Design a protein around this nucleic acid. Structure first.
Lengths: 513, 416, 453, 204, 315
RNA sequence: UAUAUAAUAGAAUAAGAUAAG
RNA sequence: UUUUUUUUUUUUUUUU
């Protein structure tokens, strides 16, 4: 290929004047056919990237620039499309600021100063917007996570004014984008939901999905619209997609739907076709079913069987919810539980502090986890992660490791020092540390003094059984401060004003000291 | 003999002085024409001719500096005035970007060379820093070295008064829209000279006294070394114009020196004005509230606390009756004045309330019907509550207007 | 190891923690540097937390502002200003502290304005982290400091902070030179209300900060002195030297505490290093207490270990020995020969202090003198008139007479002639300088000197 | 030449609008000018909007198929959204849809999707015509059709989407397009069995 | 030592020469003292260098990602709107006047940049350089980078490396050229005489006068002006040869070989790195420092110190 | 009878001495 | 353990 070799050489040496469209065409033919060694050759791609960086990318669409950048990144060249400036005074048009926002959204490089500038050049010319342009700019602003609620409210009012000129998809997209905006007013939301429910008989499944997402985001303040959509969709329940059924479950859990008659129908329809769900959708369906108190003997088995085919490659952020669901439910889940423990053992390296703490906490009281090899690995990993644990993640990890019988005095001492650095606010944030120390039953006297000084103010808000547990922990640790026992006895006196031998031995010993 | 190369910042006269004298005379004439105006096209013709002459002179100076090693043979005063004119002609828009950058790059290079030698006195550092940061010309090494050398407070101990005043005014005037990265070095320049200002407290004149205090306060700096600087002003009230007493009250409040005794004199001096304005009344109300919040019901003189409040209330009424002469620019001023009056239970005549609410109605009769253009919803709610407390018969139009505005939703939220 | 950018930032933060507060293992630093070298966030979208963590970990591990990762993180911080909430503000501020570019200054100023605006809605964690982060940047926003001090006082009136928070708060507010007696009084009250929850490790730094801030009240020092006297037995050499320095900074003549501290110091004489010896000698110089047996012990230990002596340690040691009068023969020789080797590490004022200490004791070694004189050309720019006078007198006693070395010193003297010739002391020093160098070596300074001003 | 000097073309378009020459120009000339303007991402959309508005309904009434599809494609690529031009386009499509080539049909469908056309009857009947002539669709036509933004909206009926899906499975040989079509089928409103079979055919 | 603050315990020293070895960036780390045997150059390459005075290594010495990193660092060094940190750590830079020009040259970069510091300690080039100098010790002297303009990059006239290195006593030097980009006769490939390293028994031709206000023809044709008749007879048979280098290609050059670099007539910039390695037993000539702000040597003192680190030591 | 389309999000988490005016 | 906070401040007379 003498001609091909010459062309490649001339491209490599940066001696060819390339336009943005030519680079786009070369990228497309390299990514589609790739009969030649274009992507495999590094020098040619480096030369093409050098030509693209110095070119004029205004003559290509944001999608084309994004595709060029993706093609360059697929081989290793760190490429990023240029940022377009705000149009000048003559080119200030409703169709150009929307283009600026669209390019900012597509290329995934958002500048808030540019957003403010194009939001201040849109207000004077806001009267020139087409009905669809408003529904486009609302979603574009929502996808940029803008915090300007007044502009979105004005846009929503205008969208309401041109109701008859908009399709169902535009109305649903405007509704969901409005629901995603945090600071928007509630009267506008009520008007939009009324508009949606008036034009609700034309909805496609995509519009159903958008409306369900909007309702879930808004919350249980909008029960009437959810009731209307539940009553309408009862005809389509059998012939319905799985994802929208999962969204129905999520909305049912969120709104606390007391009408448990249609919930059974929708749940049965979901469990019929639950085989066609991905990781996130299946996890959300599990959580929604648990929070609605729907896990029966048979549907739990089918959902667990569906989870089995996914448990091998679950994300580290989707292991704790399934463990919690299995823990709360009283049915048989030994096989799924073992697979999840194996996956957690595999993922122990990348697990963060919170996820590791949750995994340890769920398996604190699990009998089969006592002899499983995850205990030592998780203990070492928690000791490593102890610097990054928070006030609650540390407590969860300590509770899980103490309940599992993992014995390592150094880890519990370091946890005590970390807790002293953070400080304690609830008894549930201090008890796991005490039982972890009592597992080994040894600590320096300064640790005992600090623990007692933390416990003493907290003794005025403990139940009698918790006082018994605290006294047990303090006796095991070997405390001798008198004010702590004074406060404990003072609290005990209120519940049992009688010093009669009726109370157990520990109580008489406590009040004696 | 050693080859020292130190020349005083303020003999060794090169062609730079001759170049700069022409610029000085041309700028002086172009400035004098502005005073002569108070034939706009006619005087614009002379302005254009002078601008072209100055541009040609600066072009010749830049070419001479580039071609010939004149900077090394130059002294220091000529270098400083060259920097001054290079920065000053740009804000007057008599130079282009290319020429300005070409001159200032060489100026910074020569300044860095002299700093490396060590011949930069404690005054030249301040001069270069103030005339560079206010022009917002960024050179990394120059900025870093100046910021590091402004931390040797032992050097800046015997600076002259005139240089202190010049730097203070230069930093004060161009503070309004300065870039954020300049603020920290501005504060460092102000603080390096703070001790010298402190020992200069008993030497300033009163307008310059307030100028320096306002310059330090607007740069969110309240150093302790300038503590006497305020005190003398507190002990020298009665020589100030009525308008200046408002800024003096604000400065004293921000300096933790506002007490009852000085507040009485400040309120009295404000009351001697020919006609009140929004600034004076607002400052008086804020000062009255601040002093009213400084009495304790269980303190050393808790029994004597009740008369003091009464006294303050009386002084409040002194401003309360003269509340119609002012012209409110924005709603927050009205809201602050009314809130101060209501919280302290000050008595206000019905005529003053009528005028205040009429101006408020005329102000809110812009945001909702024009709708082209920032009154937040909470501010409108506070205004409605105030009107309801004082009665809706005062401004019947305003009540309905606010109600229809809240129904419509024209007023945005605070979160937005 | 291939990982997502968030999964890389998490391990980077863990590596930073382990290398920071669990021993400075060089292998961890090298691995973190190698991992962060190839890390880029140009394409992937991340939270503000992940970007802030990446920027902080990159800046911590020696990465300057010229790198790609630092540039991308600073660009993200400049563009998306509203996503950097209070939770992730101190991380960005701490990362930008060392950087001194224009973008770093803009980011620091924007974060300062944000913190000063929202200073009344924070909690103990957020306030402590924000003030600690703003301590490191050297910023001088006094209004922000006043707002944060007010919030600290209100939040500590209800017993919110604890030992670690108080230590961090005191250190941050002392480094920023904010002499608010009410704020430090509130911090002290909160500390004393934490009975037996302020251990030695949390008590020594508090005393050090309270000494450094320079509080006029002398009643506060008494309580710290008594509590230290109670806690002497549980201390290593580090804290003994630390409180020597602290109670030298206070400047109050205590007797029992000093005796017990000296007993504990001579107990641990086999654990003292160069920095601890230098700190103890400097503290004794500052307080003026003459303790010759302890000085002999410290001199012997400093003779035992000389390689650990850094430029700061060398300077402090020689200055203290020269001021006190006690001096050894071979110890000075070892120190001078070592300082000759590391003459390229002395600071602007440490060099002057070392040279003047060696000149004042009439100890002249050719190698050390030559090294210090040749080095005294990159530091003359950063010298005050008194330090310049001291260095010039040291050079005159050293008999250098080298124009390449003399002309920058004389340039500095001429550029600061008012503060040079009007010093209340040093008139005899300048007289000896000019007697050595004569009138013809530098005309203008002679003409000024025969004019007395 | 991919030459971008928008001031020159703005002056030319201002002369075109001021001279009232848009009411006498030919349909193919209008399409060519609009396509040339769109090919370089013209900045001043106000001039193009005025130029397109100025033309009368008489021209819209008897436009041929190809110039009309060129005009609507140039409108879509310029991000132009005109409520009153689109109704003329819709009635003209109602008149002359039967003469559209498959590539013209794909271009019309994807361009109308790109401008968020609210009419559903025209889109549904265009999709029905495309399904009727599915045996002749090329590769680029299928990429243009199934590459539309809201493609899953149009895949309403099994009749309108079965031959198109089988033709795409037979002809299309790009993994990314097959994945996109499978995702659209998942998000569509087709019967579950057809979706499952099509996903099985396309992926794997 | 002293006490380092907690947030400063990971920072690198101001001068990167203070680092005893090489950072972990670029390649992982230096291998073991007995694992350096896999970087030996072939004897045929040694003979070719000794015959021609230059040779290009058989394989590229850096992978592509490392080349991108090095190019990015070179780009950041030549920054003008925001000057590079540690700029004052260089021996000399083209932006000392803050203006710049078509050709950007930077010397002493290894003290002020990561990666560039690690480039000094590359086993692939250091082992070959040691093999060139009779298998002995090698000490880095200094390095530089050239970056030409987009379309008006000037051409360096004919030059001999030793013409400026008169402070070093013996002729014991070697130069390694790394091409961070793809070079050509129109883009900046080096053109050098195939046999000029053995002319005049090791003497140096006089400095060449060039006019910096004209085209490349006279710049490349001054060689005839600077040579004598016999040198012309030698040159006629073997004309100067331009070697085209790709990314990562390394070129070993004798200090006495006449070489020049063609200008840049491509559509973008081109970057190249030169690293000059001495050998052991290389002595000075005069008192004072060889490079600006470096250690001051004696009359005939052997060259050593932190400014000239040892990068490879056999046995 | 024409050379070409491209958008789905999840994680709440605190280290600590600069030879000053 | 009881001291303090909430403005659109813009008026400094040099030849640098």
């Amino acid at each position: 290929p003498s001609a091909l070799h010459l062309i490649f050489e001339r491209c490599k040496l940066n001696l060819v004047e390339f336009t943005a469209q030519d680079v786009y065409q070369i990228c497309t033919t390299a990514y589609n056919m790739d009969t030649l060694g274009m992507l495999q050759d590094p020098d040619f791609m480096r030369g093409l990237h050098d030509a693209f960086r110095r070119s004029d990318q205004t003559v290509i669409s944001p999608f084309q620039a994004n595709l060029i950048a993706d093609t360059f990144r697929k081989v290793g060249i760190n490429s990023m499309p240029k940022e377009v400036s705000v149009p000048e005074e003559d080119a200030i048009s409703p169709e150009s600021l929307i283009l600026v926002l669209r390019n900012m959204n597509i290329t995934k490089q958002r500048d808030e100063r540019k957003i403010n500038e194009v939001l201040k050049l849109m207000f004077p010319i806001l009267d020139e917007f087409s009905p669809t342009q408003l529904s486009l700019t609302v979603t574009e602003l929502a996808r940029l996570k803008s915090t300007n609620a007044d502009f979105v409210g004005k846009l929503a009012k205008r969208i309401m004014e041109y109701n008859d000129d908009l399709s169902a998809l535009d109305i649903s997209s405007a509704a969901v984008s409005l629901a995603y905006c945090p600071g928007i007013s509630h009267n506008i939301l009520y008007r939009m939901m009324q508009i949606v429910e008036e034009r609700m008989g034309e909805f496609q499944p995509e519009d159903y999905i958008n409306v369900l997402h909007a309702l879930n985001t808004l919350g249980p303040k909008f029960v009437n619209t959810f009731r209307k959509i539940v009553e309408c969709g009862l005809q389509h329940v059998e012939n319905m997609d799985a994802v929208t059924l999962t969204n129905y479950m999520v909305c049912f859990s969120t709104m606390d739907y007391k009408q448990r008659e249609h919930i059974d129908i929708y749940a049965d329809a979901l469990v019929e076709v639950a085989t066609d769900l991905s990781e996130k959708d299946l996890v959300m369906a599990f959580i929604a079913l648990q929070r609605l108190r729907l896990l029966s003997d048979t549907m739990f088995g089918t959902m667990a069987s569906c989870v089995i085919r996914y448990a091998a490659k679950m994300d580290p952020r989707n292991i704790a919810p399934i463990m919690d669901i299995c823990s709360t439910v009283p049915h048989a889940s030994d096989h799924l539980m073992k697979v999840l423990m194996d996956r957690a053992v595999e993922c122990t390296r990348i697990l963060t502090a919170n996820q590791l703490g949750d995994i340890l906490d769920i398996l604190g009281l699990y009998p089969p986890a006592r002899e499983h090899p995850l205990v030592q690995l998780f203990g070492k990993q928690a000791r490593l992660r102890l610097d990054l644990m928070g006030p609650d993640a540390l407590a969860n990890a300590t509770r899980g490791l103490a309940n599992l019988g993992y014995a390592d005095p150094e880890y519990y001492a370091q946890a005590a020092e970390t807790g002293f650095r953070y400080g304690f606010k609830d008894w549930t944030l201090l008890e796991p540390m005490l039982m972890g120390l009592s597992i080994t039953g040894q600590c320096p006297p300064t640790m005992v003094r600090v623990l007692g000084s933390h416990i003493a103010p907290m003794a005025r808000s403990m139940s009698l059984m918790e006082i018994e547990r605290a006294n047990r922990y303090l006796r095991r640790l070997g405390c001798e401060d008198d004010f702590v026992y004074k406060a404990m006895a003072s609290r005990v006196l209120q519940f049992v004003k009688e010093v009669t031998p009726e109370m157990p031995e520990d109580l008489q010993v406590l009040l004696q000291r | 003999p050693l080859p020292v190369s130190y020349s005083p910042g303020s003999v060794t006269s090169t062609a730079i002085t001759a170049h700069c004298d022409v610029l000085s005379e041309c700028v002086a004439k172009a400035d004098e024409l502005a005073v002569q105006l108070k034939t706009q096209e006619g005087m614009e013709e002379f302005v254009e001719e002078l601008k072209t002459s100055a541009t040609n002179e600066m072009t010749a100076l830049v070419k001479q500096m580039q071609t010939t090693p004149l900077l090394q043979r130059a002294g220091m005063h000529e270098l400083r005035r060259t920097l001054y004119y290079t920065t000053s002609l740009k804000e007057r828009d008599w130079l282009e970007e290319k020429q300005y950058t070409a001159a200032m790059r060489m100026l910074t290079v020569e300044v860095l060379r002299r700093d490396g030698d060590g011949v930069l006195s404690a005054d030249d550092v301040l001069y270069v820093t103030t005339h560079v940061v206010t022009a917002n010309f960024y050179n990394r090494h120059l900025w870093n070295r100046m910021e590091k050398s402004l931390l040797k407070f032992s050097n800046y101990e015997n600076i002259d008064m005139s240089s202190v005043k010049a730097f203070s005014t230069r930093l004060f005037k161009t503070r309004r829209g300065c870039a954020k990265e300049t603020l920290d070095i501005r504060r460092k320049v102000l603080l390096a000279m703070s001790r010298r200002v402190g020992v200069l407290a008993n030497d300033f004149d009163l307008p310059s006294l307030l100028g320096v205090l306002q310059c330090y306060t607007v740069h969110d700096l309240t150093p302790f070394h300038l503590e006497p600087l305020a005190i003398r002003a507190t002990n020298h009230v009665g020589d100030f114009t009525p308008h200046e007493c408002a800024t003096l009250a604000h400065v004293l409040r921000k300096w933790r020196t506002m007490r009852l005794e000085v507040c009485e004199r400040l309120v009295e001096r404000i009351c001697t004005s020919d006609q009140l304005t929004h600034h004076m009344a607002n400052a008086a109300m804020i000062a009255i509230r601040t002093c009213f919040n400084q009495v304790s019901d269980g303190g050393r003189n808790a029994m004597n606390a009740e008369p003091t409040r009464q006294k303050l209330r009386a002084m409040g009424e002194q401003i309360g009756c003269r509340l119609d002469e002012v012209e409110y620019p924005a709603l927050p001023v009205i809201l602050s004045i009314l809130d101060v009056v209501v919280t302290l239970k000050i008595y206000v005549p019905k005529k003053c309330l009528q005028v205040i609410f009429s101006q408020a109605n005329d102000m809110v009769a812009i945001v909702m019907e024009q709708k082209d253009d920032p009154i937040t919803a909470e501010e409108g709610r506070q205004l409605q509550a105030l009107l309801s407390h004082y009665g809706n018969d005062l401004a019947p139009e305003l009540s309905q207007r606010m109600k229809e505005a809240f129904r419509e939703g024209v007023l945005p939220d605070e979160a937005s | 190891s291939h990982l997502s950018a968030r999964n890389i930032a998490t391990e980077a933060l863990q590596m930073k923690k382990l290398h920071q507060e669990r021993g400075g293992n060089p292998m961890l630093a090298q691995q973190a540097r190698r991992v962060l070298f190839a890390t880029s966030i140009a394409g992937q979208n991340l939270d503000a937390r992940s970007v802030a963590l990446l920027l902080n970990t990159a800046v911590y591990f020696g990465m300057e502002s010229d790198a790609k990762l630092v540039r991308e993180c600073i660009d993200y911080c400049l563009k998306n200003d509203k996503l950097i909430t209070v939770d992730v503000l101190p991380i960005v501020v701490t990362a930008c502290a060392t950087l001194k570019s224009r973008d770093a200054r803009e980011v620091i100023e924007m974060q300062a304005q944000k913190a000063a605006r929202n200073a009344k809605f924070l909690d103990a964690k957020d306030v402590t982290n924000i003030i600690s982060a703003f301590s490191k940047t050297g910023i001088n926003h006094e209004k922000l400091f006043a707002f944060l001090s007010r919030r600290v006082q209100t939040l500590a009136r209800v017993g919110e902070f604890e030992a670690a928070h108080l230590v961090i708060l005191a250190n941050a507010f002392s480094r920023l030179r904010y002499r608010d007696k009410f704020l430090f009084g509130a911090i002290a009250r909160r500390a004393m209300s934490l009975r037996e929850r302020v251990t030695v490790n949390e008590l020594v730094p508090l005393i050090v900060a309270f000494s450094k801030i320079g509080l006029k009240d002398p009643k506060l020092s008494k309580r710290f002195a008594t509590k230290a006297m109670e806690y002497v037995d549980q201390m290593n050499a580090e804290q003994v030297a630390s409180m020597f320095m602290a109670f030298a900074y206070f400047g109050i003549r205590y007797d029992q505490l000093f005796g017990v501290l000296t007993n504990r110091a001579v107990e641990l004489i086999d654990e003292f290093n160069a920095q601890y010896i230098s700190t103890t000698l400097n503290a004794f110089q500052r307080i003026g207490i003459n303790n010759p047996e302890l000085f002999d012990n410290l001199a012997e230990r400093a003779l035992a270990v000389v390689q650990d002596h850094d430029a700061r340690d060398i300077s402090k040691t020689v200055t203290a020995l020269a001021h006190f009068g006690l001096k050894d023969e071979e110890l000075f020789k070892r120190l001078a020969s070592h300082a000759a080797s590391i003459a390229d590490q002395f600071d602007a004022m440490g060099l002057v202090n070392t040279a003047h200490a060696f000149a004042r004791t009439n100890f002249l070694q050719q190698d050390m003198a030559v090294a210090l004189s040749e080095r005294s050309v990159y530091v003359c720019r950063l010298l005050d008139a008194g330090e310049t006078r001291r260095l010039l007198w040291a050079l005159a006693k050293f008999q250098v007479r080298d124009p390449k070395i003399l002309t920058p010193v004389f340039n500095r003297c001429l550029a600061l002639h008012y503060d040079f010739f009007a010093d209340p002391t040093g008139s005899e020093e300048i007289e000896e300088i000019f007697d050595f160098y004569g009138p013809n070596f530098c005309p203008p300074l002679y003409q000024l000197y025969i004019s007395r001003g | 030449k991919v030459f971008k000097q928008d001031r020159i073309l703005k002056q030319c378009l201002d002369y075109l609008v001021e001279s009232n020459a848009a009411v006498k120009l030919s349909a193919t000339s209008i399409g060519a000018m609009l396509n040339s303007l769109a090919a370089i991402r013209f900045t001043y959309h106000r001039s193009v909007k005025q130029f397109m508005i100025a033309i009368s309904t008489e021209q819209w009434s008897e436009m041929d198929a190809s110039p009309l599809v060129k005009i609507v494609s140039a409108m879509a690529k310029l991000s132009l959204r005109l409520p009153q031009v689109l109704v003329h386009v819709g009635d003209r499509l109602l008149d002359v849809y039967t003469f559209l080539s498959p590539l013209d049909t794909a271009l019309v469908i994807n361009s109308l999707q790109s401008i968020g056309y609210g009419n559903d009857e025209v889109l549904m009947m265009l999709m029905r015509h495309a399904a009727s002539s599915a045996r002749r669709w090329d590769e680029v036509s299928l990429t243009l059709l199934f590459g539309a933004s809201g493609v899953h909206r149009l895949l309403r009926n099994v009749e309108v989407a079965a031959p198109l899906l089988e033709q795409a499975a037979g002809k299309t040989s790009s993994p990314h397009l097959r994945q996109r079509i499978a995702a659209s089928l998942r998000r569509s409103a087709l019967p579950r069995a057809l979706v499952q079979s099509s996903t099985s055919l396309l992926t794997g | 030592k002293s006490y380092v603050l907690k947030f400063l315990r990971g920072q690198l020293p101001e001068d990167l020469k203070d680092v005893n070895g090489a950072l972990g960036c670029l390649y992982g780390t230096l291998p073991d003292v007995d694992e350096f045997g896999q970087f030996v150059i072939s004897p045929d390459v040694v003979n070719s260098f000794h015959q021609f005075g230059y040779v290009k290594m058989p394989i590229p010495v850096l992978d592509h990602q490392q080349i991108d990193k090095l190019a990015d660092e070179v780009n950041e060094l030549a920054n003008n709107v925001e000057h590079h940190p540690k700029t004052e750590r260089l021996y000399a830079t083209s932006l000392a006047d803050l203006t710049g020009g078509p050709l950007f040259f930077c010397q002493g970069q290894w003290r002020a940049a990561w990666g560039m510091h690690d480039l000094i300690y590359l086993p692939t080039i250091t082992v070959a350089a040691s093999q060139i100098l009779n298998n002995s010790l090698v000490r880095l002297w200094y390095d530089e980078v050239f970056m030409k303009a987009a379309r008006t990059g000037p051409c360096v006239p004919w030059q001999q490396n030793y013409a400026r290195w008169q402070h070093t006593k013996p002729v014991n030097h070697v130069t390694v050229m790394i091409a961070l980009d793809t070079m050509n006769k129109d883009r900046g490939a080096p053109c050098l005489v195939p046999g000029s390293h053995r002319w005049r028994e090791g003497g140096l031709l006089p400095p060449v006068s060039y006019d910096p206000t004209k085209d490349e023809a006279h710049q490349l044709n001054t060689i005839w002006e600077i040579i004598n008749e016999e040198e012309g007879e030698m040159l006629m048979d073997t004309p100067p040869v331009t070697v085209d280098l790709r990314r990562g290609e390394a070129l070993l050059i004798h200090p006495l070989t006449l070489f020049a670099t063609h200008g840049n007539r491509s559509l973008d910039a081109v970057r190249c790195c030169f690293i000059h390695y001495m050998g052991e037993k290389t002595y000075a000539v005069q008192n004072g420092p060889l490079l600006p702000h470096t250690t001051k040597f004696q009359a005939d003192a052997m060259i050593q110190g932190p400014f000239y680190p040892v990068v490879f030591d056999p046995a």
